[PDB]
Design an enzyme around this catalytic site. Sequence first.
Site, PDB file in Angstrom:
ATOM      1  N   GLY D  55       1.555  24.929  87.027  1.00 18.85           N
ATOM      2  CA  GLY D  55       2.230  25.410  85.810  1.00 18.85           C
ATOM      3  C   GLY D  55       3.722  25.677  86.003  1.00 18.85           C
ATOM      4  O   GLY D  55       4.398  24.953  86.731  1.00 18.85           O
ATOM      5  N   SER D  84       0.451  21.666  92.125  1.00 18.81           N
ATOM      6  CA  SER D  84       1.754  22.146  91.654  1.00 18.81           C
ATOM      7  C   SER D  84       2.010  23.560  92.177  1.00 18.81           C
ATOM      8  O   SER D  84       1.862  23.792  93.372  1.00 18.81           O
ATOM      9  CB  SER D  84       1.804  22.087  90.128  1.00 18.81           C
ATOM     10  N   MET D  85       2.338  24.510  91.304  1.00 18.03           N
ATOM     11  CA  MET D  85       2.502  25.922  91.730  1.00 18.03           C
ATOM     12  C   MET D  85       1.221  26.563  92.296  1.00 18.03           C
ATOM     13  O   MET D  85       1.277  27.571  93.004  1.00 18.03           O
ATOM     14  CB  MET D  85       3.106  26.789  90.607  1.00 18.03           C
ATOM     15  N   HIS D 109       3.459  18.072  92.978  1.00 21.10           N
ATOM     16  CA  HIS D 109       3.986  17.641  91.695  1.00 21.10           C
ATOM     17  C   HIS D 109       5.444  18.061  91.581  1.00 21.10           C
ATOM     18  O   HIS D 109       5.810  19.140  92.010  1.00 21.10           O
ATOM     19  CB  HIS D 109       3.127  18.249  90.580  1.00 21.10           C
ATOM     20  N   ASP D 148       3.480  12.339  93.343  1.00 21.65           N
ATOM     21  CA  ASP D 148       2.225  13.059  93.119  1.00 21.65           C
ATOM     22  C   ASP D 148       1.230  12.930  94.300  1.00 21.65           C
ATOM     23  O   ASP D 148       0.036  12.711  94.105  1.00 21.65           O
ATOM     24  CB  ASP D 148       1.559  12.591  91.796  1.00 21.65           C
TER      25      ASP D 148
END
Lengths: 169, 167, 170, 169, 171, 169, 170
Positions: D55, D84-85, D109, D148
Amino acid sequence: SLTDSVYERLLSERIIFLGSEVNDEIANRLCAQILLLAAEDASKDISLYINSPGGSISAGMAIYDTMVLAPCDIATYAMGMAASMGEFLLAAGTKGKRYALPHARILMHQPIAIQAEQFAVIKKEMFRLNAEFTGQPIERIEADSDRDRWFTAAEALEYGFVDHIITRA
Amino acid sequence: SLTDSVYERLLSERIIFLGSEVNDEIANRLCAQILLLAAEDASKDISLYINSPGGSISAGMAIYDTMVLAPCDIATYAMGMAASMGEFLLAAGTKGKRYALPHARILMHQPIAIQAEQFAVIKKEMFRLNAEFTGQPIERIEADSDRDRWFTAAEALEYGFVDHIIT
Amino acid sequence: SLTDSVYERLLSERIIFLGSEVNDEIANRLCAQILLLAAEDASKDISLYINSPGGSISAGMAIYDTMVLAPCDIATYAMGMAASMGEFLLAAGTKGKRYALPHARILMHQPIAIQAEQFAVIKKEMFRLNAEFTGQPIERIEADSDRDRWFTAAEALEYGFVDHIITRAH
Amino acid sequence: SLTDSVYERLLSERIIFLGSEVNDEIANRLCAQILLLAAEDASKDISLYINSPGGSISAGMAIYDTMVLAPCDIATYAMGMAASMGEFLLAAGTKGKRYALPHARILMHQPIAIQAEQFAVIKKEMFRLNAEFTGQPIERIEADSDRDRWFTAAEALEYGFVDHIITRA
Amino acid sequence: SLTDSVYERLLSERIIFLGSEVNDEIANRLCAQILLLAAEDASKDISLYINSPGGSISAGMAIYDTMVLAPCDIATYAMGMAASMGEFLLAAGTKGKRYALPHARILMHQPIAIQAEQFAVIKKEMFRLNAEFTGQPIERIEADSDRDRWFTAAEALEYGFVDHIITRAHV
Amino acid sequence: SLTDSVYERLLSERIIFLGSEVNDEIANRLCAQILLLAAEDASKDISLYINSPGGSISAGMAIYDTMVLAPCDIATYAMGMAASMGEFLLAAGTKGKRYALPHARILMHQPIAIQAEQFAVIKKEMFRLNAEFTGQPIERIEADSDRDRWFTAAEALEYGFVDHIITRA
Amino acid sequence: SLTDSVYERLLSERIIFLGSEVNDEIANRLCAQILLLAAEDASKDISLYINSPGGSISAGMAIYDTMVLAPCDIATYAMGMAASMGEFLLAAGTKGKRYALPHARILMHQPIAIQAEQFAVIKKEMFRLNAEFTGQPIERIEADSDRDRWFTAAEALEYGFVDHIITRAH
């Protein structure tokens, strides 16, 4: 909710509120409270604080029937507005214990074949009882209802809706 | 909810809040709280914190009448805004226990036949009481209400809405 | 709810949160918490964690008053964003006890006749106080607000918004 | 609710979950939980279980800042997805105490003038911190994020996101 | 609510339910309960009752990993339906403690470039583990999955999804 | 809520209700309740009150299996309507402890290729079990279901769905 | 909620309410409450307070059956309206313990091939039981029902629906 919590804590102080229009639901909720208080102690007073534009005669009349049923005294307090059935309930409190706060206002108000029969019978009962509560003749009650007569606290004392104007408790 | 939990916990410290517009509902809520606190202890002060843009005259008078009814002193505090009926309630607290916070503002304001009759008398009775509360003449109260006069804390102290500014 | 439950338990550790825009309801809720904690114990610190876009200048000014009124220190912490009144409340923390987390952002912004009058008065007072909190001249506060100056944690320390940057265990 | 009740009960065991997308509201709740736990007992580990498609960098970075502020160790567990995060917070755990479950997956990401500027600063900070967490060069992190890159538990271990693959506790 | 209070009370008896489809939300809530129970007491069985038409593989694998992570045994019970990932979770229970009720039913089922790479990998692994759970060859699992093979309790016992069919519990 | 609070308190008396359509949700809640009661005390009876128009055979079947699993007797009471799967679950109570209240009514009723296969075997199994609960031949169960045969309490006793008609507990 | 805790606290005084339309859901909650009170103490009275427009004949008979089932006396009170099944349940309370409040109103009314059959059967029982509750002949119950005869409290006492009219402290 905070609001509900406060009402429930007041219920433990035997203090109840009629703070909105009188309708079937509110009548139920209020009859319930009176019954609960009478059930938990038959001899300690109940204090009913009234700020209500009033409403349905049958609804107000059920609150009234329950006030009668309760063995304990019901002190009533015109806390802001007592209009229509709100006025009636104010005037129905135990005699000696009906109070107006100094800036309260008391308003009178005149509110399918079977419905019309039922309503005629309950309306006449309302006038009869309003006469007993105040000591006024029924005819004076009908006429005053018809013209939407309203009363300051002093005027209300004079007329017979309450027994005292209370400033400090 | 957390927010109702905090106000409940403050109730136990005999502190209540008028933090919104005065209408019938809020008037009821606030009268209930006063009655409750008076029932629990007739001899301890209640503190009323006020941040309110005001609202209806009749609703404010029911609060007022309940304030007077309670045997205990009611200290008032202008916390942010005390406008219209919120100014009235602030100025209604026990003489000697009316407070403004340093950046509080105080605002004055003027708020079917039978309806109009009652409004005329309650409006007049509100100006009358505001004059008593502040020591101003009724005429100054009307004229200042008319023009929406507003006050810093210092100016409010001088005019007579409060007795102390607390820092 | 779990969220409310957590904020309540944090209230027991005397930690409070400003995690949304400043308006009247939020200001009310926040002054209530400060009063509650002040009444429970006037001696122990209160910690205010700030992640807020700011909002109403008068609302923020009421919170500020309640901070000043509290007999105890208020520690302030910039968690994510401290913008407008959020920046003001951060800088208003007890000197020595103002913190930024290292990725915090501190933003300055420029924040009916009768409303305008009051706003002019409140605005001038906010600039005056922000000057005092940071040690900057009043005109620097004004010009920095006009051009929407933002600050990293480090830049905020240098400017005077905070005293500490928590780059390791606190 | 039952759901909130189990999460609450888990707080008493010093376990927290990241089970959804990282955003401002989630960050607030999680920062709150870490602060609560740190205040209750500074010396006992906190366990953070992660199943998150990542996010906002901003919101992730607030949680990270709180992790650093916390004096107690924070053990991290890739429970299903750490993207991601979510990958970031996993790799942010106390070195020696970052774990992947055997079937966890780890996704990298790459996620107005002054918004762009705040974004550039915080994005550079994410890459720099991911580099420090993993022991990889920042250029690798950048390229790998760009395309990615994803990881099985074993591959994630080799890369430096976690310290152990845990099958039985 | 009554329903929640019942599940919470059951939680105290170390009893958990999979009563709907396996998705991310449900996976989070089940892993949460497993972890809570393992923390409360590492040495006591957890009982997982299953009535579920299955759902996402990755969601089901997170429940599975958590089941394996827990130091204590997980007993599994096919309560009505165990389909797709519900069948897989049933079959993943601790050996000797997988049960079918007499009228349970077990159903096999077969459920952007980077997304495809990941799905290919977990699909294969799911088959591998289903083969290990049941003792069946991988190619039988794959083909049975393909044709949506289903089983009565007696057929599920013989296939290897459970270790017991139970009609009446003891005291 | 009041409703839930009464159903909860009734659970301490070991009393459960089936007062709506049998679907998966209600099957889950009811299995949960039986499982809980058997877990708290495997030796005390459970009382199941039924006022239900039936529904899914699957769902009904899962409830049935849990009734049988529970080591304790389960008394059933046809409280208003026991129709279709409701009749089935009524008739499934522990023999000797199946009851109709005096004005209860019992209604029989009969309720993708792979879905059809499953439905065929559970329907057949339901008729078989109904024949064993009642003592009626399977062909009479089938025939009567097909024509929606309904029963007064006295007729249900005669046919075998229940063992007693209770008037006073 | 306030209301729910009031209804619950009243349950501790063994007092129940029927203050709405009778349907399956309500019937269920009312039978539940009766069974609860019966289980708690099989030898104290239950008080049923009725302000109800009535509703389903089936739902009403489930409530009736459960009141007969309970080993304790069930006192009944007409609080505002008792119509259709509401009147039935009022009339069904333990004899000697049926009450009307003075301004209460009691109303009678006349209440797919398979449903017609079932309905014909419940309707006949309902009239039959109404006749014995009141002491009134079946023809009279039937005629009164199909002309929508309504009663004041006083007329209800005369007809046999109640034993007492509460005109003073109870």
